[PDB]
Design a protein around this ligand. Structure first.
Ligand SMILES: *[C@@H]1O[C@H](CO)[C@@H](O)[C@H](O)[C@H]1NC(C)=O
Ligand SMILES: *[C@@H]1O[C@H](CO)[C@@H](O)[C@H](O)[C@H]1NC(C)=O
Ligand SMILES: *[C@@H]1O[C@H](CO)[C@@H](O)[C@H](O)[C@H]1NC(C)=O
Ligand SMILES: [Ca+2]
Ligand SMILES: [Ca+2]
Ligand SMILES: [Ca+2]
Ligand SMILES: [Ca+2]
Ligand SMILES: [Ca+2]
Length: 651
């Protein structure tokens, strides 16, 4: 899994590092990643850090963080080489050369290791060029050499005990019992620029794909924008048959036609630079991947393909953002610069697109998370992201796509988790998107606020348990571990029964008395919106989440769900912007899958309306919840809506 790892807070460890040249292991420059770093601050002397011998036979990537922290950063100091040597000789071969840190930011460097650096006796060396005074300092932290050999399709870790091989780094966190966890968890105390937990790469590839559109480039395609390319096989087989080989003098650019992407969530293609072809040599030969919407001049950046990452044909997987799911979106690859004909050559093949989620729902992630740890901390929020290029770039695992605002497939919730909406420990269960179903995919939980406390536990990543255990179980390597009171391979058999009716006129001003509802957020019971049915109504006034979730029901013998709704009229001013309407969802797997039932435009309900929703078969279920929710509002006393007289019956 890992050939080398050191955050310098786990011990210099003489089994990892030769004695350094004029360094200190500590906090002389403050936080780089977290805790201690290897710092260089002497005015003279060689500045050098060197590993002991390593077996890099199947080493793929070298990663490290570098920066000046709170120390003086460089304007004119000599640059810093990253090199390797074999057989404990002094013949250092340069891998990369980077200028000494010249901002305050810490940069994470990802280096793809050439073949000649893969051997049985290899060291790596960080060394600053010698002087002819160092006016500045620099520091190293979180050094990692990944192993490509030994590989898994499932990652399971409840930290009891932790498998260190499952994790790269978690800066700001410790594996320990805290935050009222079940045994150990990954606990962030809240002390610092980076606070995240990153998994190792997992093999989430699938045996076949169900693409509905593809381009194989067996002849120059019609309607594309193609500059500087020939249809051929100069770089060898990129996927199958011929490919687009960008070997010409001049501009090298590839653009799809404007496409209807409103049903697509994942763009894929195979790519290679060098190898059989002439390789790129520096980052000016990099490929820029961007998108464009028809009618609008702006280029939406997507990713960058680096000259060193794709020396063999490799799958590139990119998320088509909700802003890019339009009736006319095009995708473009452009090289920055090259050194002439047949120089720094790249090739692409088998462009194809996939839906947001695979039809099979074949893979999932599940975890427990606590935000705040027994104290609601505003601004405490964790984004769940994935990478398919060894951490070079990251994407939110799911991005919301809601009516009017988004034209793509309906996706109600982004994989973002804030303290405002969660209390204590909560289990999150998510089907993985197609774009993450690759062959080196890693996951990370990243704090996006500041000193916020949080923790994660019971992590599962891999093939989906049956029905994601129906929201009533933990998915394990060996199937569902069901919660108390539930049983079966998907935890579908329940011991309790649920009411086959609901009825609420909202006579009580105390939200704590509503046991027929699971959640009442952002609302009060009052006359603020006048009379809807009779007496008071539930008026959604407040800042933050505005939602109403019924308790668990049994709608198997129910025909309709009925309620009175009003959107706006001074204490009930109507929603004024698109997407500020109300959505009705249902879920019968404990909130894993919220299915859209109806959408009430912000433009249609100024006078109270008796709404009667005839239930489709899929919404007549034992153990179901109905939710009314306003995802967007101006969060004051604005865009107010109200509900009253909720009724469901059964025969
Ligand atoms: C070095 O790594 C390779 C590939 O992982 C392995 O076959 C070899 O046995 C290793 N050498 C030693 C001394 O462990
Ligand atoms: C250097 O390392 C190579 C690894 O392929 C080994 O075969 C060779 O014997 C070594 N030679 C010396 C002089 O150390
Ligand atoms: C660090 O330098 C990079 C390179 O120009 C830049 O993108 C970034 O904004 C800099 N950080 C700060 C805090 O200026
Ligand atoms: Ca550290
Ligand atoms: Ca645990
Ligand atoms: Ca082809
Ligand atoms: Ca009422
Ligand atoms: Ca508004």
């Amino acid at each position: 899994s890992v050939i080398l790892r050191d955050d310098f807070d786990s011990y210099l460890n003489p089994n990892i590092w030769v004695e350094c040249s004029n360094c200190e292991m500590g906090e002389q420059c403050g936080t780089i990643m977290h805790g201690n770093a290897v710092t260089f601050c002497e005015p003279y002397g060689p500045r050098e850090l060197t590993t002991t011998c390593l077996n890099t036979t199947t080493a793929s990537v070298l990663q490290f963080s570098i920066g000046s922290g709170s120390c003086r950063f460089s304007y004119s100091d000599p640059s810093i080489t990253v090199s390797y040597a074999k057989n404990n000789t002094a013949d250092w071969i340069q891998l990369e050369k980077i200028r000494a840190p010249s901002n305050v930011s810490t940069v994470i460097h990802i280096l793809y290791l050439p073949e000649e650096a893969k051997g049985e006796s290899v060291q790596f060396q960080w060394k600053q060029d010698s002087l002819r005074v160092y006016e500045a300092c620099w520091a190293l932290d979180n050094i990692l050499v990944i192993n490509s050999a030994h590989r898994e399709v499932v990652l399971e870790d409840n930290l009891d005990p932790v498998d260190t091989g499952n994790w790269l780094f978690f800066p700001g966190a410790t594996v320990k019992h805290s935050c009222q966890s079940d045994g150990n968890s990954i606990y962030f105390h809240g002390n610092s620029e980076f606070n995240f937990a990153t998994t190792r790469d997992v093999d989430l590839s699938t045996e076949d794909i169900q693409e509905q559109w593809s381009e194989e480039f067996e002849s120059q395609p019609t309607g594309w924008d193609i500059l500087g390319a020939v249809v051929g096989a100069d770089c060898g087989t990129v996927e199958s048959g011929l490919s687009l080989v960008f070997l010409k003098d001049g501009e090298r650019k590839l653009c799809t036609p404007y496409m209807d992407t409103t049903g697509y969530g994942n763009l894929r293609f195979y790519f290679v630079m060098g190898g059989i072809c002439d390789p790129g040599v520096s980052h000016e030969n990099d490929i820029i991947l961007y998108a464009k919407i028809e009618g609008r001049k702006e280029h939406i950046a997507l990713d960058t393909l680096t000259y060193s990452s794709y020396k063999v044909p490799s799958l590139v997987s990119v998320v088509i953002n909700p802003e890019l799911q339009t009736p006319a979106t095009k995708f473009c690859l452009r090289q920055k610069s090259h050194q002439g004909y047949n120089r720094n050559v790249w090739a692409v093949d088998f462009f194809h697109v996939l839906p947001v989620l695979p039809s099979t729902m074949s893979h999932m992630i599940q975890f427990s998370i606590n935000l705040g740890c027994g104290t609601h901390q505003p601004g405490n929020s964790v984004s769940l992201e994935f990478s398919t290029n060894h951490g070079r770039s990251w994407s939110l695992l799911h991005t919301e796509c809601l009516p009017e605002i988004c034209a793509g497939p309906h996706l109600p919730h982004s994989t973002v988790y804030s303290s405002e909406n969660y209390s204590g420990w909560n289990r999150i269960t998510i089907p993985l998107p197609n774009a993450a179903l690759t062959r080196d995919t890693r996951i990370r939980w990243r704090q996006t606020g500041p000193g916020n406390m949080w923790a994660i536990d019971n992590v599962y990543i891999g093939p989906s348990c049956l029905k994601f255990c129906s929201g009533r179980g933990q998915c394990t390597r060996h199937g569902c571990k069901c919660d108390p009171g539930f049983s079966g391979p998907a935890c579908e058999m329940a011991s309790q029964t649920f009411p086959m009716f609901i009825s609420e006129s909202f006579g009580s001003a105390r939200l704590s008395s509503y046991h027929n509802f699971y959640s009442i957020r952002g609302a009060e019971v009052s006359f603020g919106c006048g009379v809807l049915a009779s007496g008071k109504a539930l008026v959604f006034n407040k800042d933050g989440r505005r939602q109403l979730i019924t308790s668990f029901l049994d709608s198997s013998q129910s025909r309709f769900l009925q309620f009175t709704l009003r959107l706006g009229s001074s204490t009930c001013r109507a929603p004024d912007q698109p997407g500020e309407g109300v959505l009705l969802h249902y879920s019968y797997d404990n909130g894993i899958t919220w299915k859209l039932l109806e959408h009430y435009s912000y433009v249609n309900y100024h006078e109270p309306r008796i709404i009667s929703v005839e239930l489709p078969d899929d919404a007549r279920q034992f153990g179901i919840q109905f939710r009314w929710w306003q995802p967007y509002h101006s969060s004051q006393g604005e865009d107010v809506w109200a509900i009253d007289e909720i009724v469901m019956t059964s025969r």
